[PDB]
């Protein structure tokens, strides 16, 4: 069904740009991922029936929550595609293979609940996974799908390479734990400014891949303002539903997850953009200068939040 999809020609041109919004093409998302895989890895990387069976299985294991959903999977994959494209050489074939599958799988089975929640209100997942709670469960969900019948898209690789790619993926998914991000950036900014950053160093590499994942995970802030506005509505809904359950167990949530304090959201993003996004895409533009448009967009959206602050 999926397997004879062919992407529209106007979309072949625009999918290459950073600001591209997948949003209005819901039925084309599976075929846009397939297209994106073929363009970056080639038409022959996986067996089509294996890929399409996997791609649809992933989709099934994403829930109908307001933000951390199938749409967000394809969005973050797209932005990876764009970075990989604009910096093709730097990364290996096995990295390209893994990061796109990673971005597409990185929130597999999200419920709308932060690590923080799952840990406080003592839940199984926090039981099994002490830290980066959900981000582990996502990688687990990735492998259970990878090991369904006819779903193992990697089976034509050696054991050696199957366990390299799965590492790349594990690392990547885990790194989308925004908790881990902040310390990662600081190392990169330093490794950069001290003339010492060496893409050849495996450990330096994984950090950059890490920073890449966070640039991708957050890339909603790098789209035209109306799309960015509308997406924040989607996360904050998810955040608010979370905050309501803290209220139903007699605990005030942080303002961010309290729907009654929605006035403060503009300042919340103003911080998040200053504390996280601007620095995120600023270290990324230093390491990979062809990703500059991402920092460009972030800044435009910052002043929109700043504008909203002062009555405009
Ligand atoms: C729900 O997790 C809370 C405990 C803490 N927290 C909230 C965030 C957070 C905030 C404020 N905004 C985003 C965010 N986006 C920024 C708004 O547009 C959508 C993407 N993505 C991921 C995590 N985000 C990161 N950590
Ligand atoms: Mg996540
Ligand atoms: Zn995500």
């Amino acid at each position: 069904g999926l397997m004879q999809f062919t992407l529209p020609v106007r979309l072949c041109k625009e999918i290459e740009l950073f600001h591209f919004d997948i949003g209005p093409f819901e039925n084309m998302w599976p075929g846009i991922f397939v297209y994106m895989v073929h363009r970056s890895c080639g038409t022959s990387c996986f067996e089509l029936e294996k890929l399409c069976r996997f791609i649809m299985s992933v989709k099934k294991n994403y829930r109908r929550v307001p933000y951390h959903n199938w749409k967000h999977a394809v969005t973050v994959a797209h932005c990876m595609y764009a970075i990989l494209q604009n910096n093709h050489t730097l990364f290996t074939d096995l990295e390209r293979k893994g990061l796109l599958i990673a971005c597409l799988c990185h929130d597999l089975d999200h419920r709308g609940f932060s690590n923080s929640y799952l840990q406080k209100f003592d839940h199984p997942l926090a039981a099994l996974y002490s830290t980066s709670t959900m981000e582990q469960h996502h990688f687990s969900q990735t492998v259970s799908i990878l090991q369904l019948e006819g779903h193992n898209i990697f089976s034509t690789l050696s054991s050696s390479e199957y366990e390299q790619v799965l590492e790349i993926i594990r690392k990547a998914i885990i790194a989308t734990d925004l908790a881990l991000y902040f310390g990662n950036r600081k190392q990169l900014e330093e490794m950069y400014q001290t003339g010492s950053l060496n893409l050849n160093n495996q450990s330096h590499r994984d950090r950059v891949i890490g920073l890449m994942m966070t640039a991708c995970d957050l890339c909603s802030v790098t789209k035209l303002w109306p799309v960015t506005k509308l997406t924040a509505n989607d996360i904050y809904a998810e955040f608010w539903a979370e905050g309501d359950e803290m209220k139903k167990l007699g605990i005030q949530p942080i303002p961010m997850m309290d729907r009654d304090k929605k006035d403060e959201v503009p300042q919340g993003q103003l911080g998040f953009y200053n504390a996280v996004a601007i620095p995120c895409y600023t270290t990324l533009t230093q390491i990979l200068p062809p990703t500059e448009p991402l920092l460009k967009a972030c800044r435009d959206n910052l002043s929109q939040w700043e504008k909203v602050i002062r009555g405009e």
Side-chain angles (χ1 to χ4, degrees), residues 133-145:
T133 314
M134 283 296 285
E135 292 87 41
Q136 295 228 54
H137 176 64
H138 299 330
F139 175 76
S140 167
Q141 287 281 306
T142 307
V143 193
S144 317
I145 293 177

PDB file of all heavy atoms in Angstrom, residues 133-145:
ATOM      1  N   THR A 133      14.391   7.932  32.187  1.00  0.00           N
ATOM      2  CA  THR A 133      13.385   6.879  32.325  1.00  0.00           C
ATOM      3  C   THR A 133      12.674   6.505  31.011  1.00  0.00           C
ATOM      4  O   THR A 133      12.769   5.368  30.544  1.00  0.00           O
ATOM      5  CB  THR A 133      12.322   7.279  33.391  1.00  0.00           C
ATOM      6  OG1 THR A 133      12.972   7.803  34.561  1.00  0.00           O
ATOM      7  CG2 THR A 133      11.444   6.080  33.764  1.00  0.00           C
ATOM      8  N   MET A 134      11.964   7.466  30.428  1.00  0.00           N
ATOM      9  CA  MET A 134      11.219   7.237  29.195  1.00  0.00           C
ATOM     10  C   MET A 134      12.155   6.960  28.021  1.00  0.00           C
ATOM     11  O   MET A 134      11.914   6.040  27.227  1.00  0.00           O
ATOM     12  CB  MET A 134      10.333   8.447  28.870  1.00  0.00           C
ATOM     13  CG  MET A 134       9.087   8.536  29.705  1.00  0.00           C
ATOM     14  SD  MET A 134       8.006   7.135  29.393  1.00  0.00           S
ATOM     15  CE  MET A 134       7.320   7.557  27.797  1.00  0.00           C
ATOM     16  N   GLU A 135      13.226   7.754  27.929  1.00  0.00           N
ATOM     17  CA  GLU A 135      14.190   7.645  26.839  1.00  0.00           C
ATOM     18  C   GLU A 135      14.768   6.216  26.732  1.00  0.00           C
ATOM     19  O   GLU A 135      15.146   5.773  25.644  1.00  0.00           O
ATOM     20  CB  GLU A 135      15.308   8.689  27.000  1.00  0.00           C
ATOM     21  CG  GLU A 135      14.871  10.154  26.816  1.00  0.00           C
ATOM     22  CD  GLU A 135      14.339  10.826  28.088  1.00  0.00           C
ATOM     23  OE1 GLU A 135      14.919  10.616  29.169  1.00  0.00           O
ATOM     24  OE2 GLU A 135      13.344  11.586  28.001  1.00  0.00           O
ATOM     25  N   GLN A 136      14.835   5.491  27.847  1.00  0.00           N
ATOM     26  CA  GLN A 136      15.210   4.075  27.801  1.00  0.00           C
ATOM     27  C   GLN A 136      14.074   3.241  27.217  1.00  0.00           C
ATOM     28  O   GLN A 136      14.264   2.549  26.219  1.00  0.00           O
ATOM     29  CB  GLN A 136      15.620   3.552  29.178  1.00  0.00           C
ATOM     30  CG  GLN A 136      16.888   4.209  29.704  1.00  0.00           C
ATOM     31  CD  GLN A 136      17.917   3.219  30.241  1.00  0.00           C
ATOM     32  OE1 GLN A 136      18.317   2.275  29.551  1.00  0.00           O
ATOM     33  NE2 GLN A 136      18.371   3.453  31.467  1.00  0.00           N
ATOM     34  N   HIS A 137      12.895   3.336  27.823  1.00  0.00           N
ATOM     35  CA  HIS A 137      11.697   2.659  27.313  1.00  0.00           C
ATOM     36  C   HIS A 137      11.455   2.881  25.797  1.00  0.00           C
ATOM     37  O   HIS A 137      10.926   1.995  25.118  1.00  0.00           O
ATOM     38  CB  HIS A 137      10.468   3.084  28.129  1.00  0.00           C
ATOM     39  CG  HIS A 137       9.179   2.518  27.621  1.00  0.00           C
ATOM     40  ND1 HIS A 137       8.915   1.166  27.604  1.00  0.00           N
ATOM     41  CD2 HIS A 137       8.082   3.123  27.106  1.00  0.00           C
ATOM     42  CE1 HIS A 137       7.711   0.962  27.101  1.00  0.00           C
ATOM     43  NE2 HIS A 137       7.183   2.133  26.790  1.00  0.00           N
ATOM     44  N   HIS A 138      11.840   4.049  25.273  1.00  0.00           N
ATOM     45  CA  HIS A 138      11.713   4.323  23.833  1.00  0.00           C
ATOM     46  C   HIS A 138      12.659   3.441  23.030  1.00  0.00           C
ATOM     47  O   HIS A 138      12.267   2.836  22.030  1.00  0.00           O
ATOM     48  CB  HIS A 138      12.005   5.791  23.495  1.00  0.00           C
ATOM     49  CG  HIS A 138      11.081   6.763  24.157  1.00  0.00           C
ATOM     50  ND1 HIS A 138       9.789   6.643  24.538  1.00  0.00           N
ATOM     51  CD2 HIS A 138      11.476   8.029  24.528  1.00  0.00           C
ATOM     52  CE1 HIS A 138       9.426   7.834  25.115  1.00  0.00           C
ATOM     53  NE2 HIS A 138      10.460   8.651  25.098  1.00  0.00           N
ATOM     54  N   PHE A 139      13.912   3.376  23.467  1.00  0.00           N
ATOM     55  CA  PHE A 139      14.889   2.516  22.807  1.00  0.00           C
ATOM     56  C   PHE A 139      14.494   1.038  22.908  1.00  0.00           C
ATOM     57  O   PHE A 139      14.703   0.270  21.971  1.00  0.00           O
ATOM     58  CB  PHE A 139      16.272   2.728  23.397  1.00  0.00           C
ATOM     59  CG  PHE A 139      17.301   1.790  22.858  1.00  0.00           C
ATOM     60  CD1 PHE A 139      17.824   1.979  21.589  1.00  0.00           C
ATOM     61  CD2 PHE A 139      17.740   0.710  23.615  1.00  0.00           C
ATOM     62  CE1 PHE A 139      18.773   1.117  21.086  1.00  0.00           C
ATOM     63  CE2 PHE A 139      18.691  -0.156  23.120  1.00  0.00           C
ATOM     64  CZ  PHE A 139      19.210   0.044  21.854  1.00  0.00           C
ATOM     65  N   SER A 140      13.927   0.650  24.048  1.00  0.00           N
ATOM     66  CA  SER A 140      13.407  -0.700  24.227  1.00  0.00           C
ATOM     67  C   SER A 140      12.307  -0.966  23.219  1.00  0.00           C
ATOM     68  O   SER A 140      12.353  -1.972  22.506  1.00  0.00           O
ATOM     69  CB  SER A 140      12.868  -0.899  25.642  1.00  0.00           C
ATOM     70  OG  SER A 140      12.092  -2.087  25.730  1.00  0.00           O
ATOM     71  N   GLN A 141      11.322  -0.065  23.157  1.00  0.00           N
ATOM     72  CA  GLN A 141      10.245  -0.171  22.165  1.00  0.00           C
ATOM     73  C   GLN A 141      10.797  -0.241  20.737  1.00  0.00           C
ATOM     74  O   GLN A 141      10.221  -0.915  19.888  1.00  0.00           O
ATOM     75  CB  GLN A 141       9.248   0.988  22.292  1.00  0.00           C
ATOM     76  CG  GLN A 141       8.333   0.897  23.512  1.00  0.00           C
ATOM     77  CD  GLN A 141       7.171  -0.085  23.343  1.00  0.00           C
ATOM     78  OE1 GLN A 141       6.399   0.001  22.388  1.00  0.00           O
ATOM     79  NE2 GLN A 141       7.031  -1.001  24.292  1.00  0.00           N
ATOM     80  N   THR A 142      11.915   0.435  20.478  1.00  0.00           N
ATOM     81  CA  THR A 142      12.537   0.386  19.162  1.00  0.00           C
ATOM     82  C   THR A 142      12.961  -1.028  18.820  1.00  0.00           C
ATOM     83  O   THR A 142      12.713  -1.500  17.718  1.00  0.00           O
ATOM     84  CB  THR A 142      13.770   1.293  19.070  1.00  0.00           C
ATOM     85  OG1 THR A 142      13.427   2.623  19.477  1.00  0.00           O
ATOM     86  CG2 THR A 142      14.303   1.326  17.648  1.00  0.00           C
ATOM     87  N   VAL A 143      13.578  -1.718  19.771  1.00  0.00           N
ATOM     88  CA  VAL A 143      14.140  -3.045  19.498  1.00  0.00           C
ATOM     89  C   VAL A 143      13.068  -4.146  19.402  1.00  0.00           C
ATOM     90  O   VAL A 143      13.226  -5.103  18.641  1.00  0.00           O
ATOM     91  CB  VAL A 143      15.203  -3.432  20.543  1.00  0.00           C
ATOM     92  CG1 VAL A 143      15.991  -4.657  20.069  1.00  0.00           C
ATOM     93  CG2 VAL A 143      16.141  -2.251  20.807  1.00  0.00           C
ATOM     94  N   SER A 144      11.988  -3.999  20.166  1.00  0.00           N
ATOM     95  CA  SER A 144      10.866  -4.941  20.123  1.00  0.00           C
ATOM     96  C   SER A 144      10.177  -4.906  18.773  1.00  0.00           C
ATOM     97  O   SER A 144       9.652  -5.920  18.307  1.00  0.00           O
ATOM     98  CB  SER A 144       9.838  -4.605  21.201  1.00  0.00           C
ATOM     99  OG  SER A 144      10.486  -4.288  22.417  1.00  0.00           O
ATOM    100  N   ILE A 145      10.164  -3.724  18.160  1.00  0.00           N
ATOM    101  CA  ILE A 145       9.629  -3.567  16.818  1.00  0.00           C
ATOM    102  C   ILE A 145      10.626  -4.127  15.815  1.00  0.00           C
ATOM    103  O   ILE A 145      10.235  -4.887  14.927  1.00  0.00           O
ATOM    104  CB  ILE A 145       9.295  -2.100  16.506  1.00  0.00           C
ATOM    105  CG1 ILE A 145       8.128  -1.634  17.392  1.00  0.00           C
ATOM    106  CG2 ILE A 145       8.930  -1.940  15.038  1.00  0.00           C
ATOM    107  CD1 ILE A 145       7.760  -0.165  17.223  1.00  0.00           C
TER     108      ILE A 145
END
